[PDB]
Amino acid sequence: HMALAAPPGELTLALTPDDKTLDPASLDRALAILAEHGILVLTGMLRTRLTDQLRTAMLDDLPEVLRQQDVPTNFVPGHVQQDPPVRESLLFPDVLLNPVVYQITHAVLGADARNAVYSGNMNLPGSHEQPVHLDEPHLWPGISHPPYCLCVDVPLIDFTLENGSTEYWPGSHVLNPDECYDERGCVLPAELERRRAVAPPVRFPIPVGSVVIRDGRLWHRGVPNLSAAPRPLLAMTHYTEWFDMPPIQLPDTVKSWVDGSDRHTHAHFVAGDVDHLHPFAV
Amino acid sequence: ALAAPPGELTLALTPDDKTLDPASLDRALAILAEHGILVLTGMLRTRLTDQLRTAMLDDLPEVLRQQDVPTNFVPGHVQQDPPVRESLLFPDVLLNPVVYQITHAVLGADARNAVYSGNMNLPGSHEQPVHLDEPHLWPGISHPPYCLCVDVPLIDFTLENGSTEYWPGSHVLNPDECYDERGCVLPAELERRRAVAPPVRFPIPVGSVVIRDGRLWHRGVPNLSAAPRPLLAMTHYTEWFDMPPIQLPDTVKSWVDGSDRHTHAHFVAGDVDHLHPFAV
Ligand SMILES: NC[C@H]1O[C@H](O[C@H]2[C@H](O)[C@@H](O[C@H]3O[C@H](CO)[C@@H](O)[C@H](N)[C@H]3O)[C@H](N)C[C@@H]2N)[C@H](N)[C@@H](O)[C@@H]1O
Numbered sequence: 001h002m003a004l005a006a007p008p009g010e011l012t013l014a015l016t017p018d019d020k021t022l023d024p025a026s027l028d029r030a031l032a033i034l035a036e037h038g039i040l041v042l043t044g045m046l047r048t049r050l051t052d053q054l055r056t057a058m059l060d061d062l063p064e065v066l067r068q069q070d071v072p073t074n075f076v077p078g079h080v081q082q083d084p085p086v087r088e089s090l091l092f093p094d095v096l097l098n099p100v101v102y103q104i105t106h107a108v109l110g111a112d113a114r115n116a117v118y119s120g121n122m123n124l125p126g127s128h129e130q131p132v133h134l135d136e137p138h139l140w141p142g143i144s145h146p147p148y149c150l151c152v153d154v155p156l157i158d159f160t161l162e163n164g165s166t167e168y169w170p171g172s173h174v175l176n177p178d179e180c181y182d183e184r185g186c187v188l189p190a191e192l193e194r195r196r197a198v199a200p201p202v203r204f205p206i207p208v209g210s211v212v213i214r215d216g217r218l219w220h221r222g223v224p225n226l227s228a229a230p231r232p233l234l235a236m237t238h239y240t241e242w243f244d245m246p247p248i249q250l251p252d253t254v255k256s257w258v259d260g261s262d263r264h265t266h267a268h269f270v271a272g273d274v275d276h277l278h279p280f281a282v
Numbered sequence: 283a284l285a286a287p288p289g290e291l292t293l294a295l296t297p298d299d300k301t302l303d304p305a306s307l308d309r310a311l312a313i314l315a316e317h318g319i320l321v322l323t324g325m326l327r328t329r330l331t332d333q334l335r336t337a338m339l340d341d342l343p344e345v346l347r348q349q350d351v352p353t354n355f356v357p358g359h360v361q362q363d364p365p366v367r368e369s370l371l372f373p374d375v376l377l378n379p380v381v382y383q384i385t386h387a388v389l390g391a392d393a394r395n396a397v398y399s400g401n402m403n404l405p406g407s408h409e410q411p412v413h414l415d416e417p418h419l420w421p422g423i424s425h426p427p428y429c430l431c432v433d434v435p436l437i438d439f440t441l442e443n444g445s446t447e448y449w450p451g452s453h454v455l456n457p458d459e460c461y462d463e464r465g466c467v468l469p470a471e472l473e474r475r476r477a478v479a480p481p482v483r484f485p486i487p488v489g490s491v492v493i494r495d496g497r498l499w500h501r502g503v504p505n506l507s508a509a510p511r512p513l514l515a516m517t518h519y520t521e522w523f524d525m526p527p528i529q530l531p532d533t534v535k536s537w538v539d540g541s542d543r544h545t546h547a548h549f550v551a552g553d554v555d556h557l558h559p560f561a562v
């Protein structure tokens with residue numbers, strides 16, 4: 001793998017929290033990056049006010065998550081599945097219904113694209129290496145087809161090579177040879193080494209405030225958190241309208257601004273609070 | 283306009299055939315891949331088709347009594363669900379072993395039925411526009427099937443009584459700007475295709491099952507007979523295609539929810555009001 005000091009130029013667009021929209025040329029580069037590399041890094045998108053509240057909430061809930069009988073874990077120890085809170089005080093339009101994110105997902109997946117994941121990945125100190133996998137599979141074996149889902153990953157602290165910044169395999173999202181994937185979405189070791197020789201994986205620091213948009217079929221893995229502090233990641237995934245997903249449970253207190261929007265969410269609105277503390281753990 | 287189902291599209295069975303030998307199954311799949319429509323004659327016992335014909339003719343008055351009669355494109359093509367009472371839900375219709383052998387091979391072991399509906403073609407009906415029942419998932423992209431329509435005629439279909447027009451090989455065609463919001467084929471693309479592979483209509487005897495790609499171009503045509511022409515309609519989808527569940531009474535949960543022939547079903551306490559989301 002290649003270990004970098006910053007997000008690579010070829011994968012990165014630098015914004016401010018004031019940018020509501022990409023100019024046509026920025027949008028073209030964003031789509032060209034997603035088509036060729038299957039991963040896009042957008043720096044400077046979210047205000048620290050929002051990321052601080054979400055970091056605090058998830059660090060505060062972690063003790064109650066680790067206290068459960070069976071802690072929902074992804075592949076190997078230390079990679080915990082944890083939903084951020086769905087209380088109205090911590091549900092922010094700029095996170096759930098971000099205009100730049102939906103501009104990109106509308107262009108790739110269509111105007112009918114919808115968010116169907118409001119979850120997260122808590123990478124604990126001493127965590128193991130995940131096997132290289134995809135979060136969502138190709139819909140037929142041995143077939144080349146366009147994307148049907150884009151993962152939207154929101155780091156809630158500075159991600160470093162120390163504290164478990166995700167390993168990404170650029171260009172891996174279009175690879176679908178026969179016998180390549182197991183029931184858990186893990187890439188066959190033989191196919192990993194063939195690909196590694198042509199386009200090796202990358203890990204890079206990602207500053208808090210950034211958003212990562214990637215093809216849900218991109219090869220990646222969680223890696224060890226070698227720091228003394230949990231590394232919280234907030235996770236969303238936009239799908240084409242026709243992909244079967246369970247709805248996100250939201251309180252009906254946010255129905256007015258969520259269910260209005262032309263930035264769609266597959267949502268079920270509940271009276272009172274939702275118990276957020278797992279179907280998405282593999 | 284033919285006198286019988288064409289040889290190239292047809293496999294002749296008896297109601298006793300539970301499963302195709304590998305060579306029969308290969309021919310069935312080769313037909314679905316090339317032509318996108320397969321006709322299986324002699325599959326269902328007249329016992330079953332008579333009960334379903336009678337039930338749907340008996341329910342038609344209650345359908346025509348509705349304020350807005352759910353109609354497909356043009357007058358005379360009525361959307362009508364067959365009953366979901368336990369006495370008229372037959373494993374050999376819902377969970378047919380030959381149908382699911384074919385749909386398991388094309389769509390995978392996880393494929394599920396998500397439609398238990400029907401198409402009642404009334405005497406004096408108009409011509410539907412050529413359309414597909416389910417679209418391609420991306421514009422301008424060639425991709426494999428994700429759904430197979432299972433059409434079960436409940437009387438002998440004739441050129442007179444509105445046997446469906448089918449466009450063989452049309453299931454793989456997805457050129458830019460070809461399809462409207464209703465699934466209708468642009469007339470320009472119809473004429474281009476007509477020159478290469480023109481459409482077919484043929485009689486289909488009751489007891490037959492038609493399996494076709496859900497993307498196959500077809501249309502309802504006028505029923506010029508004195509009698510309504512009932513069609514029972516099912517559609518198998520890949521596990522990952524979003525569909526609403528079929529409402530079934532929990533009295534059939536034991537044998538439906540058991541099966542490795544999957545149904546996207548929601549089981550209800552008591553009876554379901556079957557008399558529309560599938561009318562276009
Ligand atoms: N990047 C966001 C999240 O992505 C992954 O979760 C995914 C699952 O992977 C996916 O499941 C798919 O892959 C499974 C294993 O092959 C199959 O069982 C399943 N049928 C198949 O649809 C679900 N659809 C949705 C869920 N969000 C990670 N695990 C999770 O930690 C992370 O937060």
Ligand SMILES: NC[C@H]1O[C@H](O[C@H]2[C@H](O)[C@@H](O[C@H]3O[C@H](CO)[C@@H](O)[C@H](N)[C@H]3O)[C@H](N)C[C@@H]2N)[C@H](N)[C@@H](O)[C@@H]1O
Pocket residue numbers: 354361397399400401414415416417431462463464465466515516517559560561562
């Ligand atoms: N042979 C089975 C049946 O096929 C069609 O019913 C289909 C709909 O067509 C389809 O709708 C699709 O096409 C519409 C028009 O473009 C779109 O709105 C929609 N997004 C799109 O998924 C639904 N998903 C499922 C339904 N069973 C016919 N109408 C009906 O008479 C016939 O019995």
Ligand SMILES: O=C(O)CNC(=O)C(=O)O
Pocket residue numbers: 074079121122123130135164165166167220221222223233
């Ligand atoms: O959290 C991360 O950095 C990566 N985690 C995963 O890829 C997962 O659990 O599926």
Ligand SMILES: O=C(O)CNC(=O)C(=O)O
Pocket residue numbers: 354359401402403410415444445446447500501502503513
């Ligand atoms: O009933 C028929 O023969 C054909 N009908 C249709 O294609 C329809 O209404 O979608």
Ligand code: NI
Pocket residue numbers: 133134135220221222
């Ligand atoms: Ni993952």
Ligand code: NI
Pocket residue numbers: 413414415500501502
């Ligand atoms: Ni139709």
